[PDB]
Amino acid sequence: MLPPGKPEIFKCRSPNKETFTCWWRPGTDGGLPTNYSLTYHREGETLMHECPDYITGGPNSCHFGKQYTSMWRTYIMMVNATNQMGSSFSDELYVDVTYIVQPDPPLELAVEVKQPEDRKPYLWIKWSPPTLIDLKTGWFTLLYEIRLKPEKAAEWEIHFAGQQTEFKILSLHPGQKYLVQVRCKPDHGYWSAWSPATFIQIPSDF
Amino acid sequence: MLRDLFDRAVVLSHYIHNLSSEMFSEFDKRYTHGRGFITKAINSCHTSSLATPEDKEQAQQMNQKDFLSLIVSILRSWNEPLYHLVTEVRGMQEAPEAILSKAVEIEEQTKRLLERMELIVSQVHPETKENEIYPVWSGLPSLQMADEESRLSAYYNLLHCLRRDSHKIDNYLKLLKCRIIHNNNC
Numbered sequence: 437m438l439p440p441g442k443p444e445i446f447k448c449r450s451p452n453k454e455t456f457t458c459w460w461r462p463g464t465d466g467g468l469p470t471n472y473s474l475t476y477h478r479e480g481e482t483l484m485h486e487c488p489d490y491i492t493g494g495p496n497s498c499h500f501g502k503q504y505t506s507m508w509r510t511y512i513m514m515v516n517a518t519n520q521m522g523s524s525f526s527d528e529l530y531v532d533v534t535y536i537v538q539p540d541p542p543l544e545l546a547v548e549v550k551q552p553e554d555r556k557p558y559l560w561i562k563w564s565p566p567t568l569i570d571l572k573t574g575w576f577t578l579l580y581e582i583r584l585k586p587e588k589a590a591e592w593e594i595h596f597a598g599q600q601t602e603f604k605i606l607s608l609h610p611g612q613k614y615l616v617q618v619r620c621k622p623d624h625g626y627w628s629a630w631s632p633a634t635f636i637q638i639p640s641d642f
Numbered sequence: 643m644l645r646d647l648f649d650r651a652v653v654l655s656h657y658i659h660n661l662s663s664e665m666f667s668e669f670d671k672r673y674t675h676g677r678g679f680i681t682k683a684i685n686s687c688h689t690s691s692l693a694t695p696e697d698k699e700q701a702q703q704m705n706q707k708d709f710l711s712l713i714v715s716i717l718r719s720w721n722e723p724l725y726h727l728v729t730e731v732r733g734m735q736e737a738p739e740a741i742l743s744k745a746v747e748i749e750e751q752t753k754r755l756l757e758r759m760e761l762i763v764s765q766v767h768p769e770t771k772e773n774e775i776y777p778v779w780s781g782l783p784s785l786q787m788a789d790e791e792s793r794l795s796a797y798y799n800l801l802h803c804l805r806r807d808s809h810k811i812d813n814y815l816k817l818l819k820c821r822i823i824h825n826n827n828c
């Protein structure tokens with residue numbers, strides 16, 4: 437017997453400035469929705485559009501593929517929740533892809549001990565960028581950070597790696613085991629999640 | 643020495659966008675956090691009428707000489723509003739100090755960036771048209787309004803627009819550096 441409560445578009449993110457996805461949550465204290473319709477328009481146009489892809493971002497999401505996504509242009513969007521008894525519209529959300537960039541974590545983190553001659557030995561860390569990020573044209577710029585800690589230490593040590601995909605760490609405690617992670621952010625935007633940990637035993641001979 | 647110029651150009655542009663981004667945040671937190679200023683910011687930028695690439699494909703379709711000339715037009719067009727933003731804010735009795743600071747630095751750095759860009763164009767396209775056509779900003783009376791809601795809105799729009807165009811310029815300079823120096827193998 438109740439129409440839906442007021443839905444809310446609570447997050448949008450772009451992993452690579454080429455596509456983005458937005459997510460909404462149903463309102464509580466209304467009836468159950470049997471449909472949602474997300475519509476929007478863009479700054480400097482009057483045309484109204486509907487969400488082009490309700491499937492790819494999973495539940496309660498709108499995914500905007502490349503032909504629907506551009507930078508430096510505000511999207512003004514709204515989701516309506518409907519059932520047999522009526523309907524409810526979210527507040528309008530003003531979103532610009534330029535400011536919601538958050539990459540996926542880096543890939544293939546690998547770590548190695550290296551012991552050369554008459555030169556300090558080091559821990560050698562390597563990784564790869566997330567896939568589908570266009571770095572080689574300069575469309576996208578990625579920065580990285582590593583953290584590492586042995587078990588039970590109260591603090592992480594953090595090392596800024598700038599744009600490199602490899603890094604050398606010198607001052608490790610001989611015989612200690614380290615958890616190592618890497619994350620990345622655009623030049624302008626949010627940090628990714630930390631990648632899964634890789635583990636490395638630093639040898640006694642150090 | 644293209645490689646040094648490009649590197650310095652990109653340092654300046656990335657820095658200018660960071661400052662513009664922080665300026666706009668403080669301005670917004672401080673003066674307009676609670677109202678529909680965002681809704682009034684729609685379609686208000688003086689560089690809007692320029693034909694600018696809006697995604698990577700459009701960027702790739704634009705050839706380098708037009709692309710460089712585009713960056714220069716955008717930057718040249720911001721010299722007037724940055725000059726007036728600094729003049730207006732500085733002449734207030736109770737000017738927000740973190741905000742004024744950033745505006746002064748963006749004003750001076752924008753001149754430096756435009757100097758590097760002129761050197762880059764001279765080095766890479768020595769016999770270009772010496773053509774200046776850029777979009778005119780003419781929003782000074784709005785910044786000067788006595789009506790405070792109208793005034794804060796005109797400022798909001800100016801800082802929103804600066805935050806956008808600085809980001810765009812920084813991103814286009816990064817693309818061109820990769821294109822021109824590294825043949826798109828950055």
Ligand SMILES: [Cl-]
Pocket residue numbers: 625626627
């Ligand atoms: Cl972040």
Ligand code: NA
Pocket residue numbers: 449450451455456457499500
């Ligand atoms: Na996406």
Ligand code: NA
Pocket residue numbers: 490491494495496497498
């Ligand atoms: Na959906």
Ligand code: NA
Pocket residue numbers: 454501502503504505506697698
């Ligand atoms: Na696109």
